[PDB]
């Protein structure tokens, strides 16, 4: 997932 | 699906033709990392150096001499055979096989790099290596030049020219081909499957770390061993916790489960997060949230085509957030003052999109604010979302609700093309696919 | 099962009792570990530090500060608590809750460390540190001693001793409490029910990794997320390779199929290893080999008690695999000549038994030999094994075979404890379970 | 396994 | 006069005879220090190493074994004889002729320490080792004991104790021996020599660093070739920059001119400073200055004595300044009041005394704020002095002065010897002095 | 003489004349060096740097940006101004007086280098950095740089092409401008003095280190604070060793003193070899050898021009030796034979010439076997020696033989000009000077 | 001099 | 001197  | 040895071959070659003449261009393997005293985890073998050969060993390192437009040769340094440390730590390649088996011109042992390098870039003009990537890789990559440095007496010169080969390579990674794009495909097929077991599987009282263990055997099913990133189980108020793992809780009935996981399959990886109601049905207020996540989905999948960018559509999905979180009365105020504002950060506060590849968050570059015109063959997420905390100042019935949906698509000639719509999004669908479930 | 909080009270008192007067003791946490670009490896914490604390995060060090017999506080560095890294990473203890959840004197911020750190070792004169560990904690500590060194118009000093705790806390490692013996106990089950599932899955035709994925699942429905070292499935001439985990093979009827694996519940390793006939059914050639396994096992469950070693035991394993040898015509001539000589060598080529505990292979001083008298409490495994290679100067029936069979076991007053017995060994229960199982 |  | 054989046998007893049982001390050489490209400063042994052997090549070390109370042996690790290098850079030791030479029982080549030290310290308890002093050392050292601490199976231990012996070695080092109280005082003999010199040949028109050459010369006319320190010649202003190395400006007539040089001899350091008139003539505010120094050096002289301390003397200084401060109306309010204020702060910012040997700051625990009682055989500097700023708020004539006046002297049985009173500091006499040379 | 701030500003703007648009040049100061414990040895600003700026402080910096091919701007990293620092460690230039003072368009602190440069290389194609010069110009570049590539979201982009700028800096310090030339020149007369003084002081007796007393001194007192080299006194067999430095033997009367010794002028270095007899007077033994060198010196001094090389007059002086040491029996066999044979190479073992500019041994590719054709401007030395190990299988009277004869000369368009002519160097010339200094 |  |  989400940008890290 | 897979990627063919012609493949690897025109992927060096692509990365030749960029090169100058006199030059060489070093790419280091992934190093082994400890997992707990004498134990590794098992070996990832690092992204760009899988590129260009899908070899999957440690100590390993892939050299590409340019001499000039049409003269160009390949040494790989790997490690040698031996009989004691393979009856032990499984097969290795070796010199005499690599040649043929990963199509390169020759192979030296890995043990001998500090003797031979200097002597392959002695005379070059220029060298490509990712400075700063692997400390191991620097050091050999340092020493070499060294030495050529300070033997003038021994007629040795060291290119005075150093290039990051990293911008031109993830740049070429960017761009799928028709062969990865088929196995990313198989990724996205296999990541659906799971997606759908764990829907399937879910019930009240089951522990978050369950459905991990039945997403994790189904990739495993199908060939695909390992996630492509640690899954992600968040019930109830953990939906709220963007990369939460620990996956330790009771999953309770009445609360939505939040579940983002991805197969890597042939080293390209699988991305997919589906966030449905434990007890199988959505309440109003879940339904109320989830819905406008899944128009914010549908719109996306709809406008993602050549010609705009994540930037744009980002925008249409701002809006599309806004509308709906001031009609429920979670944001109060004209819709393009609060989207004026970015009076939905405090409820989506991480990107629509990101590249994906052979590794998850892909690389290449983006453009400021991700503003890069999109083109056939670029593979990316669609992934909005709404994550209310347990105590923001809206509605009691919305605080604590964590929701995602994430596809995986590739830009096509006239639009996109979804990887991961095998497996329910539509609330009426994920139902209608739990109650079945239960009937057993 | 699990370690209370105040088993872990008494594991650093223990430490301390040990410590010299005006010292302390600096226990670091494991890094975290890229798998690829931004992803990292799920987090395993180190193991000496998880004895002290059960607590799993890194960047966290535990001082433990004796003033004296009967004076001692302790002061833990870790995460501050931050609503932006939460929300994103996962929860954090963070300072407040420490203290009451560790049962720690005091909490600091691990970001102020070089700020309080030297501070603590001011004024001590032994100062405890695994020098070499990990290159950040000594980064960190040395920082904080030349502080102190080079302090003097500022009236500091530093402990010009230095002692590794390392053979201290390893020695307290070795020797397991009712409550460790009570986990390591349920990491047996775990582990067993899962070489069972793999027994009565197994069909030719199934890819090894299939069997991985069966295993793994196991582990993950009792409560043990991970696997407490890389799985090993090798079927065929790959049992002949030890540490074989590529598990990338189509599993052939007519083979036999060797499978290492263990979980770690509560962070403790389970071990087993259980050969058996993929088609359910053991062949003439492969229960001659079996049986001298099998009987190297049985015996060493019956010797194993307090008083023997691990290397007498091994002798009475020599004599029971040379003797079976010679019996079937794979060594040829006098077996107490054959002993002396070691010709079993070329077919059991590791040890018979390891530690067991935090890590699969424990720590704690084996003694030359591993001639250390065993006393109860100790916890290893045993595991005698042949390995017949495809090219092996033997009878033809026999090339190629590889078979390991291991339990767990912890010494008890009058002998031992077997923690894996409940997966079944004897060739005639192997059978009757994939049988019945087959049924299916 | 075997000892490493 | 110099260091004995036998001085040198007696220290490393001394050494040995503070060390535990079954313990083993690495001291190692300064490494060469680049200067310029492929050029090189006159190589300095470092201090302690010197201390244990009069040794001065680089790549050595000495090992110093300690079985028990009456059992112990010694290693030096040196550089082979090299027919090539050293018909180059000069002749070296080598092994054979080493032992008799130094003193050492056994020599072993300085390329092989990797493949020998591990070996030495394998079965010991503890290791003296001066861990961050040199990168190198630390290197070898940390090599050394990881092949332990991984070697069990090869039934190799590593100490877990690790030591810095700069603390014992340092309080050694702090008191005296008569062979060592003759080097200085020939030390304090050739450097006074070297300031009487300088006043004799001082001209106004000559440049500062024009001094510095005749003190250099006449240091290396005794046998002393290095100043222990960079000669510094501050004339006018550049008297009130207390390490004023620049040495560059003309001198003028009507400035003082302060230097501040100390000559090297047989390893141990002068330390003198003498102001004078570059004219030979003391102005009148020059000497109302002057005679404040002068008399805080006198008293100093006079109270030095076992039983007193640095500190008790620096107050007896303090108040002679803030008089004479007052008197002048440099300083205005009441004598005790400023003192209590450290109103000399402004004019005197730094320590009356140091220690003195083998580096001209030399190493030694002074004890809170200076305070530790001295006892015979301690050596330090006597060097008060007065710098008033070209910008200090006081009377015209005193701004840009800088005078500082520095003798050497060794703690007594019933007070202390000067052992640089051979070059004048009293006013009529310096004048004389300088009267007497310009009639040539 | 000296070099002018237009000549700095001439050779900053030849390196950016010769730099791609968009990239920087990095060129960093030498730290400091400790010569024991707290004390330094006196600071020697790196050569490069130096070139540039002719700024002799450690921590600074000299950043070249170039735009295009008329735009172009400097920053300055230096040590800012502080009270306390400077009334200790002397005076500092500081930011503000800097760009006046040194020629540059902006000067920030060092201090805040790490929050600077980063910025001023972020959007820039190249970098031109001397990587591994120096290891904390390494941290510092590689920091900046690391931000700049992770900074992607904050718009910053990293210059992916790193070059080594030693090659071209090197290549314009080979030829000498007008005004070091004429700086070179005044080295040469000082040095040369110095060796006049040392011939002039000889007195059998005295000690080899006295002679390198009287030489500092005469550096000294023409502004020459420090040799560019450490000296070298060799007496009798001492002579042989090339790199003598230890000077600590009695010269004794029959001997033969070789002295090299080089004054640095400005940053320049003198470089001179003179080799004459104790005693004032030549034996035949020793002018037998004497002449053949001295021979060697002259006709290389008559040959050195525009279009030969180091290569070939040195192939003129191997002639002139071999057949010297044939016709004095050193040597035997057909002269033609002995030259293919390189005879001579155990009697001259080094090369007859270097480059000469900042470094003693300076900068500049001298090509295969120092092939390259001499052009005017080049700075080379010319020494050849012969040395006579004592126990070399030759006739008695030329064992433990060592002379070396060298002058520094600058090519010009039609030859060469000789910068240390004014120091005798012919056998009657020698004893006449040293006769005539006797009668004092 | 002066303690550094 | 001779190079080094
Ligand atoms: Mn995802
Ligand atoms: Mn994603
Ligand atoms: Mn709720
Ligand atoms: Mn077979
Ligand atoms: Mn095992
Ligand atoms: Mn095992
Ligand atoms: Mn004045
Ligand atoms: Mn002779
Ligand atoms: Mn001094
Ligand atoms: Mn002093
Ligand atoms: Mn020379
Ligand atoms: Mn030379």
Known sequence: ?4 | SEISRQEFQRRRQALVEQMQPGSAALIFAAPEVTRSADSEYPYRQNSDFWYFTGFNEPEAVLVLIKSDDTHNHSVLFNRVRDLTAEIWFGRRLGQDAAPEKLGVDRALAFSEINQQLYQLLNGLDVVYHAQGEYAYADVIVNSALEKLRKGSRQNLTAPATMIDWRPVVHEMRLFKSPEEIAVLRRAGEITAMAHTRAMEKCRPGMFEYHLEGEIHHEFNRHGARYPSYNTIVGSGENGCILHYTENECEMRDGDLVLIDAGCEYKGYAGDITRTFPVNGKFTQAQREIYDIVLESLETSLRLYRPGTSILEVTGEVVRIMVSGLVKLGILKGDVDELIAQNAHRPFFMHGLSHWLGLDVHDVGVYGQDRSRILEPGMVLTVEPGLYIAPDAEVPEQYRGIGIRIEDDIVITETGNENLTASVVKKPEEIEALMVAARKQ
């Open chain 1, 1 to 4: 997932x989400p940008p890290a």
